[PDB]
Write an enzyme that holds these catalytic residues in place. Structure first.
Site, PDB file in Angstrom:
ATOM      1  CD  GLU A  38      -4.118   9.502   2.584  1.00  0.00           C
ATOM      2  OE1 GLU A  38      -3.881   9.404   3.794  1.00  0.00           O
ATOM      3  OE2 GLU A  38      -4.663   8.569   1.932  1.00  0.00           O
TER       4      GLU A  38
ATOM      5  CG  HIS B 101       0.164  10.280   6.987  1.00  0.00           C
ATOM      6  ND1 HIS B 101      -0.826   9.475   6.342  1.00  0.00           N
ATOM      7  CD2 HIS B 101      -0.144  11.565   6.804  1.00  0.00           C
ATOM      8  CE1 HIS B 101      -1.623  10.345   5.797  1.00  0.00           C
ATOM      9  NE2 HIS B 101      -1.292  11.673   6.023  1.00  0.00           N
TER      10      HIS B 101
ATOM     11  CG  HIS C  97      -0.821   8.436   1.859  1.00  0.00           C
ATOM     12  ND1 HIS C  97      -1.581   7.254   1.797  1.00  0.00           N
ATOM     13  CD2 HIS C  97      -0.588   8.601   3.191  1.00  0.00           C
ATOM     14  CE1 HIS C  97      -1.774   6.828   3.018  1.00  0.00           C
ATOM     15  NE2 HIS C  97      -1.136   7.612   3.939  1.00  0.00           N
TER      16      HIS C  97
ATOM     17  CG  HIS D 177       2.717   5.694   6.055  1.00  0.00           C
ATOM     18  ND1 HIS D 177       2.356   5.570   7.355  1.00  0.00           N
ATOM     19  CD2 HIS D 177       1.641   6.279   5.448  1.00  0.00           C
ATOM     20  CE1 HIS D 177       1.116   6.025   7.546  1.00  0.00           C
ATOM     21  NE2 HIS D 177       0.691   6.525   6.385  1.00  0.00           N
TER      22      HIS D 177
ATOM     23  CG  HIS E 255      -1.756  -1.279   1.340  1.00  0.00           C
ATOM     24  ND1 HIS E 255      -2.679  -1.616   0.367  1.00  0.00           N
ATOM     25  CD2 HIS E 255      -1.789  -2.216   2.300  1.00  0.00           C
ATOM     26  CE1 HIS E 255      -3.300  -2.732   0.708  1.00  0.00           C
ATOM     27  NE2 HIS E 255      -2.742  -3.138   1.901  1.00  0.00           N
TER      28      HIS E 255
ATOM     29  CB  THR F 109      -6.212   8.001   5.377  1.00  0.00           C
ATOM     30  OG1 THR F 109      -4.869   7.451   5.190  1.00  0.00           O
ATOM     31  CG2 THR F 109      -6.206   9.297   6.215  1.00  0.00           C
ATOM     32  CB  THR F 110      -5.481   2.545   4.701  1.00  0.00           C
ATOM     33  OG1 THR F 110      -5.009   2.037   5.925  1.00  0.00           O
ATOM     34  CG2 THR F 110      -4.466   3.471   4.090  1.00  0.00           C
TER      35      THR F 110
HETATM   36  C1  LIG Z   1      -1.224  -3.639   9.513  1.00  0.00           C
HETATM   37  O1  LIG Z   1      -1.236  -2.219   9.063  1.00  0.00           O
HETATM   38  P1  LIG Z   1      -0.974  -0.992  10.018  1.00  0.00           P
HETATM   39  O2  LIG Z   1       0.069  -0.086   9.604  1.00  0.00           O
HETATM   40  O3  LIG Z   1      -0.630  -1.478  11.497  1.00  0.00           O
HETATM   41  C2  LIG Z   1       0.694  -1.922  12.007  1.00  0.00           C
HETATM   42  C3  LIG Z   1      -2.607  -0.166  10.050  1.00  0.00           C
HETATM   43  N1  LIG Z   1      -2.397   1.137  10.612  1.00  0.00           N
HETATM   44  C4  LIG Z   1      -2.459   2.323   9.845  1.00  0.00           C
HETATM   45  C5  LIG Z   1      -1.686   3.304  10.382  1.00  0.00           C
HETATM   46  C6  LIG Z   1      -1.755   4.595   9.928  1.00  0.00           C
HETATM   47  C7  LIG Z   1      -2.623   4.907   8.901  1.00  0.00           C
HETATM   48  S1  LIG Z   1      -2.725   6.569   8.326  1.00  0.00           S
HETATM   49  N2  LIG Z   1      -2.574   6.627   6.691  1.00  0.00           N
HETATM   50  O4  LIG Z   1      -1.574   7.275   8.930  1.00  0.00           O
HETATM   51  O5  LIG Z   1      -4.010   7.060   8.721  1.00  0.00           O
HETATM   52  C8  LIG Z   1      -3.405   3.929   8.331  1.00  0.00           C
HETATM   53  C9  LIG Z   1      -3.317   2.629   8.809  1.00  0.00           C
HETATM   54  C10 LIG Z   1      -3.620  -1.003  10.812  1.00  0.00           C
HETATM   55  C11 LIG Z   1      -4.082  -2.172  10.257  1.00  0.00           C
HETATM   56  C12 LIG Z   1      -4.866  -3.060  10.979  1.00  0.00           C
HETATM   57  C13 LIG Z   1      -5.215  -2.789  12.283  1.00  0.00           C
HETATM   58  C14 LIG Z   1      -6.028  -3.768  13.098  1.00  0.00           C
HETATM   59  N3  LIG Z   1      -7.378  -3.889  12.602  1.00  0.00           N
HETATM   60  C15 LIG Z   1      -8.438  -3.655  13.461  1.00  0.00           C
HETATM   61  C16 LIG Z   1      -9.718  -3.623  12.939  1.00  0.00           C
HETATM   62  C17 LIG Z   1     -10.809  -3.481  13.769  1.00  0.00           C
HETATM   63  C18 LIG Z   1     -10.608  -3.369  15.133  1.00  0.00           C
HETATM   64  S2  LIG Z   1     -11.973  -2.969  16.161  1.00  0.00           S
HETATM   65  N4  LIG Z   1     -12.533  -4.342  16.775  1.00  0.00           N
HETATM   66  O6  LIG Z   1     -12.990  -2.402  15.311  1.00  0.00           O
HETATM   67  O7  LIG Z   1     -11.455  -2.184  17.242  1.00  0.00           O
HETATM   68  C19 LIG Z   1      -9.336  -3.406  15.678  1.00  0.00           C
HETATM   69  C20 LIG Z   1      -8.249  -3.542  14.837  1.00  0.00           C
HETATM   70  P2  LIG Z   1      -5.312  -5.419  13.379  1.00  0.00           P
HETATM   71  O8  LIG Z   1      -4.414  -5.949  12.315  1.00  0.00           O
HETATM   72  O9  LIG Z   1      -4.613  -5.128  14.740  1.00  0.00           O
HETATM   73  C21 LIG Z   1      -3.646  -4.061  14.844  1.00  0.00           C
HETATM   74  O10 LIG Z   1      -6.552  -6.337  13.696  1.00  0.00           O
HETATM   75  C22 LIG Z   1      -7.178  -7.130  12.647  1.00  0.00           C
HETATM   76  C23 LIG Z   1      -4.769  -1.613  12.843  1.00  0.00           C
HETATM   77  C24 LIG Z   1      -3.986  -0.732  12.111  1.00  0.00           C
HETATM   78 ZN   LIG Z   2      -1.068   7.527   5.970  1.00  0.00          ZN
END
Ligand SMILES: COP(=O)(OC)[C@H](Nc1ccc(S(N)(=O)=O)cc1)c1ccc([C@@H](Nc2ccc(S(N)(=O)=O)cc2)P(=O)(OC)OC)cc1
Ligand SMILES: [Zn+2]
Length: 258
Positions: free
Chosen positions: A104, A117, A94, A92, A62, A196-197
């Site tokens: 964004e 970001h 975008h 990271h 991504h 934002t993703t």
């Molecule tokens: C893996 O990508 P990431 O960078 O995190 C290290 C991303 N992070 C990421 C970082 C920054 C940005 S940006 N562009 O700066 O906004 C976007 C994504 C992000 C992805 C996925 C999650 C979680 N997803 C998730 C979904 C729902 C719930 S809930 N039950 O609704 O509370 C809990 C967890 P997880 O992988 O646990 C951390 O659990 C499946 C978390 C983070």
């Molecule tokens: Zn970002």
């Protein structure tokens, strides 16, 4: 058929697997500079990156993330609109296919070439996975990129991208100082928003710096040579990995500056 930035799996599709996409506090947003109100009560922002410990750089399919050691209070963000201490976990970017798109957030509907970001999590929640479940869990510092003079502090990043061309590739990335990515002024806008993703969690205090950094055409061209695909798969250039502006709804954007 997982999410991405193509015609068939792009931002307009995300709501089907992640219904919070149509939520009340989504990001990014357009920053209307004539509607944002100076808030004289915002504290002075504290970016404390002298002990930052970078570890690795990863192509996640991504974007690419520069990851830090966040197992102690090293590199932290405090002050501004924030209560408590937020630890740097990764940064990271975008970016666009062309210099007229890629950010964004937008400023009076202006799109910048790219957006950086720097992602931080609130230490009161103990780990990043707990933090994303809270309305005040994350603080993301957003910095706009425009194309002009080179940014010297970005070159070490640019120069390793060839080693992480495809999804799932990583490389050692120690001793990188993120202070070299900041502009001179820390004047900012702030509002409550989201990732934002996907998973688009509504857990972010956004802090968007007013002053962009300048990067060179050659630096952003190297971003655009990355791939969304894995090794041995047909080439899909990693470009236009940005979500467009979302409805502001019942939110106010605050300015730290008069
Ligand atoms: C893996 O990508 P990431 O960078 O995190 C290290 C991303 N992070 C990421 C970082 C920054 C940005 S940006 N562009 O700066 O906004 C976007 C994504 C992000 C992805 C996925 C999650 C979680 N997803 C998730 C979904 C729902 C719930 S809930 N039950 O609704 O509370 C809990 C967890 P997880 O992988 O646990 C951390 O659990 C499946 C978390 C983070
Ligand atoms: Zn970002």
């Amino acid at each position: 058929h997982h999410w991405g930035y193509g015609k068939h799996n792009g931002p307009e599709h995300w709501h089907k697997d992640f219904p919070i996409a149509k939520g009340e506090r989504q990001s990014p947003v357009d920053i209307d500079t004539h509607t944002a109100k100076y808030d004289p009560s915002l504290k002075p922002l504290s970016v404390s990156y002298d002990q930052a410990t970078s570890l690795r750089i990863l192509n996640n399919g991504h974007a690419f993330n520069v990851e830090f050691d966040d197992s102690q209070d090293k590199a932290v963000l405090k002050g501004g609109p924030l209560d408590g201490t937020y630890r740097l976990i990764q940064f990271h970017f975008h970016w666009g296919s062309l210099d007229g798109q890629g950010s964004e957030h937008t400023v009076d509907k202006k799109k910048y070439a790219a957006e950086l970001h720097l992602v931080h999590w609130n230490t009161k929640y103990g780990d990043f996975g707990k933090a994303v479940q809270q309305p005040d869990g994350l603080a993301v510092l957003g910095i706009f990129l425009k194309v002009g003079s080179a940014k010297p502090g970005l070159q070490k990043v640019v120069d390793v991208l060839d080693s992480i061309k495809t999804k799932g590739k990583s490389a050692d990335f120690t001793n990188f100082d993120p202070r070299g990515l900041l502009p001179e002024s820390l004047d900012y806008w702030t509002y409550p928003g989201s990732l934002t993703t996907p998973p688009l969690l509504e857990c972010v205090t956004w802090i968007v710096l007013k002053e962009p950094i300048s990067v060179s055409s050659e630096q952003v061209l190297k971003f655009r040579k990355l791939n969304f695909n894995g090794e041995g798969e047909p080439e899909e250039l990693m470009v236009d990995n940005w979500r467009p502006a979302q409805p502001l709804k019942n939110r106010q954007i605050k300015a730290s500056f008069k």
